[PDB]
XYZ file of N, CA and C in Angstrom:
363
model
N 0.822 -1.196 0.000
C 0.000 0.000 0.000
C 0.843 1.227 0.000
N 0.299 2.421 -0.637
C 0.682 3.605 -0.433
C 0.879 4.140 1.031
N -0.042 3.838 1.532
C -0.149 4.035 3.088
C 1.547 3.701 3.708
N 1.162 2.355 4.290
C 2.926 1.490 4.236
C 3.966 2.205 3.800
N 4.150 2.716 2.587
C 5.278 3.228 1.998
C 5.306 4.690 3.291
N 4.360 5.462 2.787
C 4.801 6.703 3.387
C 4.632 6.728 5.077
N 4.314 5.905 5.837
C 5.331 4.992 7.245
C 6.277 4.931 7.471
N 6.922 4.495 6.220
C 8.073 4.118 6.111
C 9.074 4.648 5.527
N 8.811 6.238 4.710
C 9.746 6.967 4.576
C 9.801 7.546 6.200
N 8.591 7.834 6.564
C 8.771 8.806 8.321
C 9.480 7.899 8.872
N 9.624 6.706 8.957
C 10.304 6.067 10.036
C 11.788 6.194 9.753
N 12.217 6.393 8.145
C 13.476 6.632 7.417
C 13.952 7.725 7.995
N 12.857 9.165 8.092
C 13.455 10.283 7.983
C 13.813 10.574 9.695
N 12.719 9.542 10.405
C 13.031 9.950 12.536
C 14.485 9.158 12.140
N 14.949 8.201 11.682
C 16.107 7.435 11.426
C 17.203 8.531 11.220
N 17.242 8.974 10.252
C 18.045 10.248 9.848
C 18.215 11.190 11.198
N 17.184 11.561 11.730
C 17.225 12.654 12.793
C 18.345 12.189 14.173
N 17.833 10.935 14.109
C 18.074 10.260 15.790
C 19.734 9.583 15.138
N 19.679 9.493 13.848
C 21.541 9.268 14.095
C 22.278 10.550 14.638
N 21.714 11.932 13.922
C 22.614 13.304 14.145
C 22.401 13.307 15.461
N 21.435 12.854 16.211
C 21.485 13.215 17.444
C 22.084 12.432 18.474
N 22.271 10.995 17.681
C 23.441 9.933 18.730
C 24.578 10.445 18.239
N 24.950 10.971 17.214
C 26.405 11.751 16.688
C 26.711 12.966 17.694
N 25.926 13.631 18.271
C 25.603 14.427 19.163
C 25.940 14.030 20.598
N 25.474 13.390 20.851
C 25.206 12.424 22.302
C 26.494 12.301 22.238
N 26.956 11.348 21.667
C 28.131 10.919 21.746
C 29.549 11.430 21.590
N 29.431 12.443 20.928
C 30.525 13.512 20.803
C 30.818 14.463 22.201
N 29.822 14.298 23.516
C 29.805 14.788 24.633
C 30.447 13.734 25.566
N 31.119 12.397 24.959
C 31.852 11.754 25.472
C 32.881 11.093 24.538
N 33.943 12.378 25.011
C 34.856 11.800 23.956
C 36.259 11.301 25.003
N 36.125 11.045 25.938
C 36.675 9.590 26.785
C 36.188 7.970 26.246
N 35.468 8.236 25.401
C 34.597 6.762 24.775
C 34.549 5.860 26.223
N 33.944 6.509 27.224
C 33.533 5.403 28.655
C 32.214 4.772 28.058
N 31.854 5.521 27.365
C 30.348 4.529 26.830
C 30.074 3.961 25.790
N 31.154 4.226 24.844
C 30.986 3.546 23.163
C 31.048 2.070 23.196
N 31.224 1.233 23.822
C 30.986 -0.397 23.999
C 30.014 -0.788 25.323
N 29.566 -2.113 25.414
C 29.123 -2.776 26.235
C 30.101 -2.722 27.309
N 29.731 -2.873 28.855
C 30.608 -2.893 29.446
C 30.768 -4.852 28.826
N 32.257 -5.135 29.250
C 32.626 -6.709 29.087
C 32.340 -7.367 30.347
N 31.711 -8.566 30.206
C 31.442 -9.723 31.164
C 32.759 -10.332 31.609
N 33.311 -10.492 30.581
C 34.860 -10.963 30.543
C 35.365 -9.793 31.954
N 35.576 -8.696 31.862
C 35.886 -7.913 32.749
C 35.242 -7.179 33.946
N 33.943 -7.714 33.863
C 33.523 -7.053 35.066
C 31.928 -9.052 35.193
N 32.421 -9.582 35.598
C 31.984 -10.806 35.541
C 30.340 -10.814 36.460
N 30.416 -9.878 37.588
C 29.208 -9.847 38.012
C 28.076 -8.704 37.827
N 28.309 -8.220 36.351
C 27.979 -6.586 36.054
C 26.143 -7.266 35.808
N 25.855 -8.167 35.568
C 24.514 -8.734 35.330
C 23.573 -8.691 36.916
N 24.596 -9.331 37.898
C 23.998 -9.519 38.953
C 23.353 -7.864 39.247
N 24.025 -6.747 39.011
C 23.935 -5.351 39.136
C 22.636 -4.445 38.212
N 23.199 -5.147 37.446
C 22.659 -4.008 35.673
C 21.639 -4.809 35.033
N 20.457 -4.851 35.020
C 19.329 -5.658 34.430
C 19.189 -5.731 33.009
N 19.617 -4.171 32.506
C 19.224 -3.960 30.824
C 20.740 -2.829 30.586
N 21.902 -3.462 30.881
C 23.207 -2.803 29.827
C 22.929 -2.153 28.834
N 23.738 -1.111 28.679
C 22.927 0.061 27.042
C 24.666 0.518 27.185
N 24.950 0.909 25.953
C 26.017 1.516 25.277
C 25.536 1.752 24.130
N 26.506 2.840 23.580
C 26.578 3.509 22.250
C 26.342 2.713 21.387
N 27.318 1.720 20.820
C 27.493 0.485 19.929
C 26.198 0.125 19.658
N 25.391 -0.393 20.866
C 24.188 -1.223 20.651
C 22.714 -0.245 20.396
N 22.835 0.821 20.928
C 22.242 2.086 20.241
C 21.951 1.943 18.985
N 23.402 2.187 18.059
C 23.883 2.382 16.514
C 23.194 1.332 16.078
N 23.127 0.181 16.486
C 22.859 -0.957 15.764
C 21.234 -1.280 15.794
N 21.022 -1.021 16.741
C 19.164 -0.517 16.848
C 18.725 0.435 15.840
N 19.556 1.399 15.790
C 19.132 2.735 15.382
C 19.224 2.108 13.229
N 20.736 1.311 13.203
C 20.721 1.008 12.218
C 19.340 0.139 11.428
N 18.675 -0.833 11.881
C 17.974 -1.432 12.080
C 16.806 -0.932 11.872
N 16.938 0.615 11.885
C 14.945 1.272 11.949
C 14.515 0.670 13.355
N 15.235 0.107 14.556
C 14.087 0.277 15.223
C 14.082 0.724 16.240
N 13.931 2.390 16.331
C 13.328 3.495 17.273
C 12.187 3.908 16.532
N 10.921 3.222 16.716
C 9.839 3.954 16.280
C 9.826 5.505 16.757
N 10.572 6.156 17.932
C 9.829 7.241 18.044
C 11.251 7.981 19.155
N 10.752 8.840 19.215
C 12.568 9.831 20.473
C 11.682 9.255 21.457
N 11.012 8.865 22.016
C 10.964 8.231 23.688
C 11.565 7.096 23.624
N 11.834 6.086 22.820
C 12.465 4.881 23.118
C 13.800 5.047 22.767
N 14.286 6.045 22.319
C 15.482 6.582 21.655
C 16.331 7.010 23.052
N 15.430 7.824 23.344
C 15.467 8.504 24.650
C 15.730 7.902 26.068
N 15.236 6.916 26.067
C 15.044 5.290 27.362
C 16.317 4.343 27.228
N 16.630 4.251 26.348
C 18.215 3.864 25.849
C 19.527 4.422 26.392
N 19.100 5.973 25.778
C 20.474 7.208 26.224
C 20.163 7.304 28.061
N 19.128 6.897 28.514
C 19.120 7.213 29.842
C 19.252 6.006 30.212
N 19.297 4.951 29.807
C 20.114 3.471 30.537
C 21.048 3.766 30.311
N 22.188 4.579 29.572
C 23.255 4.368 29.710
C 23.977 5.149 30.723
N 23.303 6.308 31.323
C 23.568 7.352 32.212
C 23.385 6.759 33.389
N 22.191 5.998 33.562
C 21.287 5.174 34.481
C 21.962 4.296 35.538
N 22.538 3.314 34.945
C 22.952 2.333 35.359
C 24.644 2.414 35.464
N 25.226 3.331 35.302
C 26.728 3.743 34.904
C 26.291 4.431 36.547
N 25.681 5.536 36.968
C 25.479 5.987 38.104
C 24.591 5.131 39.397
N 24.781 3.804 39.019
C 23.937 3.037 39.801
C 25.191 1.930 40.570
N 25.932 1.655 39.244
C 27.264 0.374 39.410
C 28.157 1.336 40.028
N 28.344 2.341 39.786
C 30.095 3.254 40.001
C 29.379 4.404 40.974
N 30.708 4.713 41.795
C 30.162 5.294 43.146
C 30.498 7.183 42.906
N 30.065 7.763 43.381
C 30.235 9.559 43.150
C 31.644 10.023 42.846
N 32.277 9.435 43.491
C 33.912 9.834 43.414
C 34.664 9.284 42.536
N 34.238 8.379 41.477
C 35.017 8.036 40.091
C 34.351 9.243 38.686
N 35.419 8.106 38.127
C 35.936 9.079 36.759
C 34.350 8.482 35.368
N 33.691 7.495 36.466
C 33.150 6.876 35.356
C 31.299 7.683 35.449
N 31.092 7.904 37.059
C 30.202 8.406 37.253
C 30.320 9.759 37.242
N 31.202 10.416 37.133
C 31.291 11.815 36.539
C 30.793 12.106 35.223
N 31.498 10.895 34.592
C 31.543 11.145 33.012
C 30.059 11.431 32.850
N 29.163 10.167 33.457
C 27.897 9.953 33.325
C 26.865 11.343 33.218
N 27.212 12.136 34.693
C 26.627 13.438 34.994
C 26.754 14.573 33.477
N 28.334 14.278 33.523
C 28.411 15.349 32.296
C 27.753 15.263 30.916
N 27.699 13.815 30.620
C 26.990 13.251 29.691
C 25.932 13.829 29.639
N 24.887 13.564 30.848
C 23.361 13.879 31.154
C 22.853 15.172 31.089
N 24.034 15.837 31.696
C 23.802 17.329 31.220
C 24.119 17.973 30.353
N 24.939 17.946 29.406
C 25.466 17.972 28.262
C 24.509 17.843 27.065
N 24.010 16.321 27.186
C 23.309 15.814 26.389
C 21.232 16.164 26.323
N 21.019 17.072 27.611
C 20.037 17.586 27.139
C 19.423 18.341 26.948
N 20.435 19.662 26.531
C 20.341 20.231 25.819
C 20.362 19.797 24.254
N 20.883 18.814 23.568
C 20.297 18.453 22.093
C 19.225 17.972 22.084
N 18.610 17.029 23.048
C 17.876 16.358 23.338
C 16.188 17.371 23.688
N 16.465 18.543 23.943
C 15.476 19.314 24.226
C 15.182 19.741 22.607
N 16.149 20.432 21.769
C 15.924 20.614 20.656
C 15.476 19.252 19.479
N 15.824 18.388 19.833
C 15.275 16.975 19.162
C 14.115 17.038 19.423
N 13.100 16.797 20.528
C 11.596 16.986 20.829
C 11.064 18.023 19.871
N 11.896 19.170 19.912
C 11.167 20.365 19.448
C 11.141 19.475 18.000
N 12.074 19.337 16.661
C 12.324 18.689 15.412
C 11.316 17.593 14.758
N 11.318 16.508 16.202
C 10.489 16.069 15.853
C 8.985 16.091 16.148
N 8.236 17.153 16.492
C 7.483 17.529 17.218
C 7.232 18.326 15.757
N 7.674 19.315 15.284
C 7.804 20.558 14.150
C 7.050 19.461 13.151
N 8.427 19.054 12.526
C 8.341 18.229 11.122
C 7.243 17.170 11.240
N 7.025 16.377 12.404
C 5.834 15.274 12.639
C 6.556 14.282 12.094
């Protein structure tokens, strides 16, 4: 159907939006503390801790995929990764800092993203 198709350019074009804005996100951590999974291999009981792990990487690959129907689930992602980084690591590291700066950093694009996709529909 015609219908279907033009779904599916919008879902193309939130696709387009929400990469510039993980290009964004992520350029506010350029320590790369968040561009991978944390490793099991290296932190062996990070499961017993962390229910739903989120990094950059696995973001991209969602995002590649088409599947963020929408900036709230886009959104629920970038805040597991802030989330649970300030949940495992204690106030006085380098990792839960990063996190803060991230969070604040990051929403300010994140305020203008709502507005974008909110505008365009």
């Amino acid at each position: 159907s015609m219908e279907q198709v033009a779904m599916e350019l919008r879902l193309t074009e939130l696709t387009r939006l929400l990469r510039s804005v993980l290009d964004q996100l992520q350029d506010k951590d350029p320590a790369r503390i968040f561009a991978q999974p944390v490793s099991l291999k290296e932190v062996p009981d990070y499961l017993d801790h962390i229910k739903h792990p989120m990094d950059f990487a696995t973001m991209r690959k969602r995002l590649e995929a088409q599947g963020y129907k929408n900036l709230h689930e886009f959104e629920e992602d970038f805040d597991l990764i802030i989330d649970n980084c300030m949940k495992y690591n204690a106030r006085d590291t380098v990792f839960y800092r990063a996190a803060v700066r991230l969070r604040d950093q990051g929403g300010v694009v994140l305020r203008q993203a709502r507005r974008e996709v909110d505008s365009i529909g």
